[PDB]
Amino acid sequence: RDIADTTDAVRDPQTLEILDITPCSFGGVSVITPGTNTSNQVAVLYQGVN
Amino acid sequence: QCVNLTTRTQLPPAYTNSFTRGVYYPDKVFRSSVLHSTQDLFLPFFSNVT
Ligand SMILES: *[C@@H]1O[C@H](CO)[C@@H](O)[C@H](O)[C@H]1NC(C)=O
Numbered sequence A: 001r002d003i004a005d006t007t008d009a010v011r012d013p014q015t016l017e018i019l020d021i022t023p024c025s026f027g028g029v030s031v032i033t034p035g036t037n038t039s040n041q042v043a044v045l046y047q048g049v050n
Numbered sequence B: 001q002c003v004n005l006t007t008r009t010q011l012p013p014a015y016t017n018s019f020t021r022g023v024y025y026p027d028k029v030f031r032s033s034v035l036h037s038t039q040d041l042f043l044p045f046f047s048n049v050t
């Protein structure tokens, strides 16, 4: 568990090594569009993700 | 291993306060650097022992 009660430290089901599991990676899709009448091309931004 | 052979004197049981003993792990979960409040069976602090 963690502060948000989320999994952060994991006992290896087998040997005695220490495992770390994070949930699925994601992001926030934000689009940068001009006017529909003016143009049709869309550039997309990814929120806080390298 | 049977009925007593008398000679059983009665010592006076002196009482001492258990300061901070009797605390254990209530769950088999792993939390890192938190402050968790729980409701469970415990020794009261500074309670007299026999
Ligand atoms: C394109 O459509 C927009 C939306 O109202 C408006 O600027 C106008 O109707 C059009 N612009 C032109 C034809 O320059």
Ligand SMILES: *[C@@H]1O[C@H](CO)[C@@H](O)[C@H](O)[C@H]1NC(C)=O
Binding pocket: B015, B047, B048
């Ligand atoms: C332990 O606690 C009380 C006061 O806290 C003490 O006077 C006494 O010796 C003990 N209690 C009992 C019931 O023996």
